[PDB]
Design a binder for this molecule. Structure first.
Ligand SMILES: Nc1ncnc2c1ncn2[C@@H]1O[C@H](COP(=O)(O)OP(=O)(O)OP(=O)(O)O)[C@@H](O)[C@H]1O
Ligand SMILES: Nc1ncnc2c1ncn2[C@@H]1O[C@H](COP(=O)(O)OP(=O)(O)O)[C@@H](O)[C@H]1O
Ligand SMILES: [Mg+2]
Ligand SMILES: [Mg+2]
Lengths: 471, 478, 56, 126
């Protein structure tokens, strides 16, 4: 006997009462399957997840779908285990929802296939691997100032409409097509249109043969958006552990998980935190993030796009997620308005891989010199804005002159961006980027106009563009 | 009896609490003895929380509440075309009852990932600036954002009027607007004959907050009826800021903890749930489409506010109307630098792609140069190829209200501007040149217009140049 | 020399006028930023007070 | 036991956040920025246990180096203000100094030591 009754329905939150001595454990999945008895009722097929034990044999749960049509007194069945999703080779090339049910119309999954729970403790201290290796992306600013780490955790920060999706699509284009391992995409809390385009892009490119996708987009209720990332993470963990293979993990917007948790938190009875968030923001985010790690048995490298609400980088959700990342890319609306794409902030972006013993002495020196010149240019901003360039000294004038060129040269033309501008785009190796910035710092190209450095790729293309412009 | 009859315990600020109603279901419609409708929101252990969808002054503690057995629904059908109704579907213009037969739920799931198709069909708004720089496709969600009194409503009215000869059904939803403005909008739509294919849903500022909160959902539910039959629907939400404010008021009356700017946590979900329902259906589902044009009002042009950033992260692009350009006589005041269409480009016809490709960047370059050129010396290229060309471009893109232009005439005038035929025409009479060219094309250039209409491609450049030169010979500079 | 001195004085006058205009524009933008910050601070304070009151 | 100990707390701000979480989950009323009223007492009683004992007590000592992370360089926030008023000095690290080429990015003007001088040898004093 595992039968309960619905007591309260308050949006996504449902209270269920069970018989004494048979309460389900926390995170267990409950099923409601009701057939309409008359014309004043509707059919219901809903799944709930246990969240709290309220006492008096009452359990508070979170619904995975819409709660419309629920009636107090409906029968609830306890499954005795958390949400379980299929794992293995069967998941490759398929598209799943939060519950692990395929949605690609390619057929159902056999009921005897192996399924794993989506809740599990994080890997222990002794199981972790800490080797650092460079992951080349072909993007000048990323490869120069904040190199990505193979097997590490990478986060992309940005406001609304700054270019996170374009950047992650470019990373998929440059890296995933020749990875050789398994790729997993989790489109939590984003546009359904983007998911449809990405699926067709994968099908056309043929990469879908090695890719598993679990979407749960923004049209879902907050309960679904809280758990789809866990489903994708479970699918990735199977490949990491049981097969020891290298895994690419893409998360489209990890901020939506925290936002859905905040939406659910108020109805659960918790008192609000500083900016209305849940008190358990840090604990929940840590429990999610600590499972995404590379171990001795396998490696997972993850790229996550993080939304910044109202362009406020001091917001608690973006602020707390900084400590979980090895390399970060910070996008700014001002650079995008200036026409500089990918609009990466050259000073806010950081990486643990920028060390002399990892990237080489020349690379480190060039990057540090570039950052120093950009910092000086930022310092001179108030004087330039009020009194103009006329009052600066000779040294400062040269600093501004070279800083403009350096800032414009960090922009690049993407393959994905060709649909917007019609320009084919380019892929730049790391050594070419280092040599180009070294030559710029030496004053070799001080005579070229600054407009020739925009969206150019390699350094020779700067000379070609300047020559075409009539210089 | 008691399972279908309730008794009111508390009434206040449009929120009621009732005892009984054992068999009521979440989201069900309930009816008071006064005849006012309500929605069951919270099903607690001993009471039901009800949101009143109307005047709550007639409801007193102890009044009877009875079930209706129906989840939130609105009437739908072709009989609703040409009428003005409230969010509940009740007629408001006073022309009699509406003879609908079907209903649709207020809350419905959006089409899935595999149920959609890429947008590939243009939506001709009849405005040169939009059709040239920020194209809109059928099934796209395009945000229109700007300050107070920047022409947001005029753009939507012109777009609706332009759909007369196209197989498009228009729905205009006014949230929190003044009743007089809605009356005048209905009058001008009737004057231009747009009421043959337009449905108007109104919830004025004097209405209670729940009606303003529910109006956009009623509009989209009405649109979905035609959308799933294989037709194309255009839906305009006149202000999502008013809906956000109404929902904030409703949430704070329920004592829910607020976030930044006192908005509730699910304020993003509120707009995302509504805007995810607009889509371009695949061929397997009939190929219908629904296009949405939400409106957002900013304060002092701040695009970094909470609600504008929430809406921007949902739609497929935004059109920014700038206040100073509007005050300086540039109407419509579209900021080319901040406006962008992610889905557009693939929606434009071949003729418009050829001539309007560089126009966005050219206009942005002129706009940034014209401020810098107020001082210092200037090279001949900047004076001629950039400043004069930008001035001509600005003069061309100007347009009068309620006068949409066919796409072929826009293509021809943009081709004339781009190929330098306007370089010797003085700036002071470019608009008169454009109108006289439109008059000339109706008599001597009919074959070019027909070729553009039939083939959707630019005609041969030789004949087009000959026609442009022939018109240019008889035009008087004055 | 006299012509050069006159031109120098005129140039300095024009440069100072332009600097004053730039400073005025900067003040104009900073005022809007200040107003936004003030509204946000008042909202945060009142929300915290009301939450503390409701906690009892 | 007469030994000398050095203790480093890598994040006191995260400890404060965890304490706020567990206090809100116990339904204790919140203060400013949702922190509990006794947030100062926590850190004050934590950091007062570091001291140098007298000769009668054995002469042992304990040194503490608490860490506080600021948001956009705002040292006027609640937790930084609470912690600054407890310790015997501050060492300020700034990103503008860091990127200007000086590393470690210690701001000598703002940094201060209240027991400075007595903690130096004669050669360093000179
Ligand atoms: N292209 C145009 N040419 C001339 N006048 C125009 C044009 N577009 C709009 N207007 C006028 O500008 C005024 C404001 O325009 P409109 O009402 O469309 O703006 P709005 O942003 O919707 O305003 P509100 O905040 O009052 O609702 C009206 O008097 C309208 O007639
Ligand atoms: N590298 C780029 N080149 C050209 N345009 C870009 C680039 N990156 C972004 N954009 C423009 O900015 C917009 C990016 O929006 P999107 O990436 O969806 O932002 P977000 O993912 O933060 O919502 C696109 O519409 C595109 O026109
Ligand atoms: Mg995006
Ligand atoms: Mg208006």
């Amino acid at each position: 006997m595992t039968r309960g009754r619905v007591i309260q329905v308050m949006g996504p939150v449902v209270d269920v009462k069970f018989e004494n001595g048979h309460l389900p454990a926390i995170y267990n999945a409950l099923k409601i399957q009701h057939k309409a008895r008359n014309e004043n009722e509707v059919d219901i097929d809903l799944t709930l997840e246990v969240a709290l034990h309220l006492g008096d044999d009452t359990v508070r749960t979170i619904a995975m779908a819409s709660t419309d049509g629920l009636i107090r007194g409906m029968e609830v069945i306890d499954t005795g285990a958390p949400i379980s999703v299929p794992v293995g080779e069967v998941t490759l090339g398929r598209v799943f929802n939060v519950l692990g049910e395929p949605i690609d119309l390619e057929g159902d999954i056999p009921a005897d296939a192996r399924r794993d729970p989506i809740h599990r403790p994080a890997p222990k201290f002794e199981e972790l691997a800490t080797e650092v290796e460079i992951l080349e992306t072909g993007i000048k600013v990323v490869d120069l100032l904040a190199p990505y780490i193979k097997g590490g955790k990478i986060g992309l920060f940005g406001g609304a409409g700054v270019g996170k999706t374009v950047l992650i699509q470019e990373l998929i284009h440059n890296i995933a097509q020749e990875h050789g391992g398994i790729s997993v995409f989790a489109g939590v809390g984003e546009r359904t249109r983007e998911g449809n385009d990405l699926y067709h892009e994968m099908k056309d490119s043929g990469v879908i043969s090695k890719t598993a996708m679990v979407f749960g987009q923004m049209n879902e209720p907050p309960g679904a958006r809280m758990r789809v990332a866990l489903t994708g993470l479970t699918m990735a963990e199977y490949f990491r552990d049981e097969q020891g293979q290298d895994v690419l993990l893409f998360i489209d917007n990890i901020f939506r998980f925290t936002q859905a948790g905040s939406e659910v938190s108020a109805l659960l009875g918790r008192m609000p935190s500083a900016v209305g968030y849940q008190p358990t923001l840090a604990t929940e985010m840590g429990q999610l993030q600590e499972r995404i790690t590379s171990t001795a048995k396998g490696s997972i490298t993850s790229i996550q796009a993080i939304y910044v609400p109202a362009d406020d980088y001091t917001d608690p959700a973006p602020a707390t997620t900084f400590s979980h990342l090895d390399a970060t890319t910070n996008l700014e609306r001002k650079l995008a308005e200036m026409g500089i794409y990918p609009a990466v902030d050259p000073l806010a972006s950081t990486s643990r891989a920028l060390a002399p013993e990892i990237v080489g002495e020349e690379h480190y020196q060039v990057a540090r010199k570039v950052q120093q010149t950009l910092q000086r240019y930022k310092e001179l901003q108030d004087i330039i804005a009020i009194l103009g360039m006329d009052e600066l000294s000779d040294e400062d004038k040269l600093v501004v002159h070279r800083a403009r060129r350096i800032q414009f040269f960090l922009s690049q033309n993407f393959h994905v961006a060709e649909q917007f501008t019609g320009q084919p785009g380019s892929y730049v190796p790391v050594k070419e980027t280092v040599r180009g910035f070294k030559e710029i710092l030496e004053g070799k190209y001080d005579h070229l106009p600054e407009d020739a450095f925009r969206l150019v790729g390699r350094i020779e293309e700067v000379v070609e563009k300047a020559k075409a412009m009539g210089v | 009896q008691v399972s279908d009859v309730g008794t009111v315990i508390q009434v206040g600020d449009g929120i009621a609490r009732a005892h009984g109603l054992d068999n009521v279901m979440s989201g069900e419609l309930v009816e008071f003895a006064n005849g006012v409708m309500g929605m069951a929101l919270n099903l607690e252990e001993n009471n039901v929380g009800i949101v009143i969808l109307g005047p709550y002054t007639g409801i007193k503690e102890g009044d009877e509440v009875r079930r209706t057995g129906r989840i939130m629904e609105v009437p739908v059908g072709e009989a609703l075309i040409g009428r003005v109704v409230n969010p509940l579907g009740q007629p408001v213009d006073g022309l009699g009852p509406v003879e609908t037969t079907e209903t649709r739920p207020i809350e419905s799931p959006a089409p899935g990932v595999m149920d959609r198709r890429s947008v590939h069909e243009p939506l001709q708004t009849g405005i040169k600036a939009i059709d040239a720089l920020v194209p809109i496709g059928r099934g796209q969600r395009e945000l229109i954002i700007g300050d107070r009194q920047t022409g947001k409503t005029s753009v939507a009215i012109d777009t609706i009027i332009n759909q007369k000869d196209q197989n498009m059904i228009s729905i205009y939803v006014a949230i929190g607007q003044k009743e007089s403005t809605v009356r005048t909008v209905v009058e001008t739509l009737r004057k231009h004959g747009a009421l043959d294919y337009t449905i108007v849903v109104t919830a004025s500022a004097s209405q209670p907050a729940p009606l303003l909160f529910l109006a956009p959902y009623a509009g989209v539910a009405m649109g979905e009826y035609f959308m799933y039959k294989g037709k194309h629907v255009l839906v305009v939400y006149d202000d999502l800021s008013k809906q956000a404010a109404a929902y904030r008021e409703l949430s704070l009356l329920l004592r829910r903890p607020p976030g930044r700017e006192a908005y509730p946590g699910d304020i993003f979900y509120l707009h995302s749930r509504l805007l995810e329902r607009a889509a371009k259906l695949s061929d397997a589902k009939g190929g219908g489409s629904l296009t949405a044009l939400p409106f957002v009002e900013t304060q002092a042009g701040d695009i970094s506010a909470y609600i504008p950033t929430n809406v921007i992260s949902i739609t497929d692009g935004q059109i920014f109307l700038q206040s100073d350009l509007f005050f300086s006589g540039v109407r419509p005041a579209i900021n080319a630098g901040l406006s962008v269409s992610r889905v557009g480009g693939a929606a434009q016809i071949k003729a418009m792609k050829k001539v309007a490709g560089t126009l966005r960047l050219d206009l942005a370059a002129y706009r940034e140069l014209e401020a810098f050129a107020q001082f210092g010396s200037d090279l001949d290229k900047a004076t001629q190829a950039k400043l004069a060309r930008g001035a001509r471009t600005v003069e061309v893109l100007k347009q009068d209200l309620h006068q949409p232009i066919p796409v072929e005439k826009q293509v021809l005038i943009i081709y004339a501007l781009t190929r330098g035929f306007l370089d010797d025409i003085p700036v002071e009479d470019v608009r008169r040149f454009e109108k006289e060219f439109y008059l000339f094309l109706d008599q001597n250039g009919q074959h070019l217009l027909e070729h553009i209409r039939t083939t959707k491609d630019l005609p041969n450049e030789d004949d087009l140049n000959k026609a442009i030169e022939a018109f240019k010979k008889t035009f008087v500079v004055s | 020399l006299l012509d050069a001195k006159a031109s120098e004085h005129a140039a300095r006058m024009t440069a100072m006028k332009n600097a004053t205009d730039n400073a005025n524009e900067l003040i104009r933008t900073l005022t809007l930023s200040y107003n936004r910050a003030r509204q946000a601070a008042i909202t945060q304070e009142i929300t915290e007070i009301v939450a503390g009151a409701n906690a009892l």
